[model samples]
Target: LQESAAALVRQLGERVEDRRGFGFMSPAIYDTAWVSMISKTIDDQKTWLFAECFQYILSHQLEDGGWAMYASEIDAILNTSASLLSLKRHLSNPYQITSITQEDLSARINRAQNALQKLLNEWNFEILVPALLRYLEDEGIASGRERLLEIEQYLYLPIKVTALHSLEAFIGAIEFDKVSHHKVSGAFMASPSSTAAYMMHATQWDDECEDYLRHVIAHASGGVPSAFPSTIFESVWPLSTLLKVGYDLNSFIEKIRSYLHDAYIAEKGILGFTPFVGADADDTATTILVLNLLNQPVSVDAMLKEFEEEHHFKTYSFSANCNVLLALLYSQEPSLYSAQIEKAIRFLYKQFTDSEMDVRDKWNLSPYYSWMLMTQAITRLTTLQKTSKLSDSISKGLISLLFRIASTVVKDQKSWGTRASKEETAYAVLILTYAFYLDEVTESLRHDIKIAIENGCSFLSDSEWLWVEKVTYKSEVLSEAYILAALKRAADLP
Candidate 1:
């Protein structure tokens, strides 16, 4: 176990090829469609700028005539809409690609168009969805602007970084040059699709923006990730997950420390997935928690000022509130941040208990990953209450919540070693592992946990691509860290 754990740490450390660490992400259909639409006028005729990207879009269409990494309605709608627009644009110009015949292109376009028209009915609207749909309608691929009206209410609102990430969707609604200033490191919110849209429409062509797209294509396999340079997120999440199991990552502390120092924005007291792309709640809280675990604590004052909301510490998802609360508990003075801590816990408690089946997160596909995060934070708080100078009990109620989550994991153990992926099974195993630490877990429940984990560990070997970005991706590094942690916990079990 020790040998395997050490080897895993070595593998993770090797993934940090640069100062920012690894940025490996799977190709996204949604981003690829926008990139495919970029064209340059050579001589008297215009042609697709990134021919390989156009080819990628053509080759990757799903059997159902849509594009997506998962069976997601939103993913398919956005991917197909953007892709359909690209197809229509290319077909009108008739680029010199011979892999697909004119008939094939015509068929693909019709299929994508039909698929999207049906998908729009089942979709829950986002600003990007309507924006992409409008682009399709303009290309004569999709009809009717009525769907745009419901989501158009948000079109004129304040332009934030989140919108900037999907700026391609707003092509006709607003002037491209107006949001040009939002670009950082030649890419808007580190999104290739957004940068591509900027280059295609903005009055001034940006050399650096084109260079950013060039670099993404150069480094990526065949297509682009939804976002790139995932240095802070890729670094912090894997490190924190490894640290959670009491593994010794002291060997790579200097590398971890350096990138985090570079990623940290002291004035905002926050960090995002990439340096200076955008400051977000999840990355900030996780970075803070990682620092604290390494005995390099930072102030939560800025986190409170930036992300603290009336009911909960705000972020894109409910899982981040759990992370914020964990960071607060690990802060130098947990008592000093008790108000923020309690409110975060209250918000999380409501979201979790009120949730049906499993607690879903915006950023990840698996429910067990979210459940594991909830378990980790709640268990940390409950453990700290007894060991630290906090209140007698933050809530005896949380103890039952922990047990309830563990019970669910055990109840579903029948599929663990069989149907569940290593990534999800590891998350469930970690939940059961943490349950053993809680005071509420009885010997009867403990017996179940042991059996479940032993059965889970029996076939635990590899991970699946279960993470969600603009599309779903699997981080092999992150998966390895999680599997190692779960295995380590199982080895030390009572």
Candidate 2:
């Protein structure tokens, strides 16, 4: 069994490289599965894979420090938040790779930290402070004293629930304290004013965070809402915030479970956004991720089996693969489904790395698609490296390829419009960042990172601060997140 498992992993690693196109979403899923499976069996291999995955993700982050929405040109705050959360998952895991000898790793992490700091620096209190305070409280920190100063500044701010939820999730995962805990606990104590105040402070806190609690309590005898639905993604944010601040879990779990059962789409063999509504690949991906977080018993093995039996093999897209991999990883029985996963991973890898996989025929001939395909490919390669060693020659070849791309982008920098949309800039930044991560720290790569940083900085430093200033008013969550993430990365360059 041990030898067979090892062999299966090795094969999957090689096969994952063959995949191609804007379908870069699944590589991370495969990497997650690979690491989860091998962590117990092969310790050293697991660490290497973890490092590789970390590096790959760090490489592809946008200049604003967030991830792009579709790996195409669009940047979305939710996707950026989700990507960051994925990275945080690895960072928070003590069993994952902890050692770092590479200077690049330190530089990359510093860049990410700087970007996060910048986001906090310009935080809109009406939208930012309440949740930030809530996040601090959830982590058991005091919230009122520091937050009191910002209350006046944010009092008139309009609520943006999605952005606020992303920020809360982002902050809640990293920091917490006793004061924050008390504030959160008190709010949940059921006073109308307290509830109203809490809602007013959150970006999406219009209906009061406590109202949801009341609804759950009222319905506790019957059924509770499931976090699997898309609506739950929005609703759960405030609830998660309240929980972080110290809400009860017994009721939370029960409510969420009831919702999941109610929303489960039998036809799709996955959870949907609404009861009896059909689920799409994207929704399924999000649902599976939420289920994993909730620690729900999802019968992914049966679902995948059903999917395979009914759907055409070629019909499955990278998005579906992403969710499917998540379901398998969270399955109660992973080993039972390893064979199918192995096949999928191998198939995907080959499609990306194989020269025979014609990009022109496979996807729209845009740099956006190329960036997406490369991101996914790199992600899978990192996963495969966990069970096997990447040859120095292959690594160097990849480095060279990335460097060449970076050089091309730098040369054509002016061709990239100064007034490009947030999504376009995000793609440009992601490609540049990936190139920076992949390129060996030879003089050329360093020069490229420096040039990219300088070029990006010039735009922001302009009196207009076009992207930054524009986003503050327009406030497209993903776009702002990516811009911030990218700038943070640029600032970190030595």
Candidate 3:
């Protein structure tokens, strides 16, 4: 316990070092879009200053002549465009530094161009037009009403804010005035690419914007992340993970409560990801659940119309859908929130019953972890309504089935066999943790549960902090928090 506990305490100390009053400084593997924008021509890109940045850009290109922040196809299109522009502006204009020959530079650009052209059929046309224009400015393209008509065919939106993940895509089409939505910290949606794009179009520059870019370039070290000042996700997730395992997180409660209140956008919803991020059912639900637990229950009724679908609460991810369901099912007043709760239960049941459910998730490697959690949560919610004692009808075989799932995947019929993956094992541990907390923890299962948990904790103790979010990134601060929860809970069991 000392080994993992001490590590947890040391990592939690990173909270006090928050510069923006958000959360601790968590690290990312690299956000390719961010690095390309900053490295290319965002600011005064000095030849000497961008040596490392340039190297990172060149080295990370895909075998298919493109770059992708994550492995998804759409991600490849956006990254390829941003990177091609980065490499091209360097080679053709100020010209890439003489580290590589013209032939070498041209070869890389050709591959990127080839990759981009191939993806055009699959990519959304309107989005592609702005991105295409950025890289293909040499081509004589139509402008004005005709172009707007072509864009209108796709959607009535531009590269503004609703979904601004790929702000660099609008390079040739955007102007300065449209980007006046800069934060006080000089960040445009906390995106290096957006800030750089705004810099290029502005008729004149503000001192703060330039200073913000400077600050970004300084901290990101050859690469920036998908967003900055990630006050929401980083802060919310760690606190939520720790609290889930029944740890006394009173130390962080006051700070987190204050942060969530301000971060909570009334007209929109809880923007859990960050400032630029749009509202989602998961964030809004998470905010309500956390606040209520901390003795500041806002309004369960507020969630009535937020993310509610006719039969389900629609969210972006499976984990997100599951999380919203957890809150709805976990609520104390089932009668008041019954309509929403029943809707959630039915939706999840159908999802679970559908054997064709795709396990591949955007944010997680394996879907088994979330699958187990949701089923268990649903089982608990179903049982909680009737009495304090879980109905035998509901919990009869659930525990045994869960244990069978956990133990069967073992190697040599002994130690749990999880590839050296922290994210992987964390999900597995969460399953076991949830099981131990239930009313089904009998004297017979206690011995089995204890060993399973002990082994799971051992796996977790040696676990890595690798979380999956486009291109696998390490989040020591956030991942460590979950591990701490698992450890503390496992140790607490008699």
lDDT value, residue 283 of candidate 1: 78
Point to the candidate with the largest TM-score.
Answer: 1
Q: Give per-residue CA lDDT, model 3, range 1-494, as digits (tens).
A: 33443344333334325553232332222344334433334456533234555666787788998875443454566566666666666666444467756678688888988887777655542454455444654532113213542653111244335334445555556655555653437766666556665665656656676676556556542565555555666655555555555555444345556656655544344554565445556656766665555556566555556666677766534666666766665455655666666566555545544544334333455554554455446555645755753225323444444444444322212333334555556555565655555554566565555566677678777324234533344555556766676677667666
Name the better of 1 and 2 by lDDT. Answer: 1
Better model by lDDT: candidate 2 vs candidate 3? 3
Model 1 residue pairs with clashes:
none
lDDT of 1 by residue, 278-318 (tens): 77787788778777666676777766778878888777467
Instruction: State the lDDT of candidate 2 residue by residue for 44-150, as single tens digits.
Output: 34332224434444555767665433322212332233234334444444355655334544444345445544544543223333443343234322333255534
Candidate 3 regions with alpha-carbon error over 4 angstroms: 1-52, 59-84, 95-104, 107-161, 182-184, 219-221, 251-253, 265-269, 329-335, 356-362, 379-419, 436-455, 462-473, 492-494
Q: Give the residue spans of candidate 1 off by over 4 A.
A: 1-22, 42-45, 69-71, 96-101, 117-125, 142-149, 153-160, 265-268, 356-358, 392-394, 415-419, 462-465
Error of 2 at 117 (Å): 53
TM-score of 3: 0.72
RMSD of 2: 22.6
Q: Considering summed lDDT, which 10 consecutive residues are worst modelled in model 1?
A: 151-160
Alpha-carbon deviation at 248 in model 2, angstroms: 20
lDDT of 2 at 331: 48
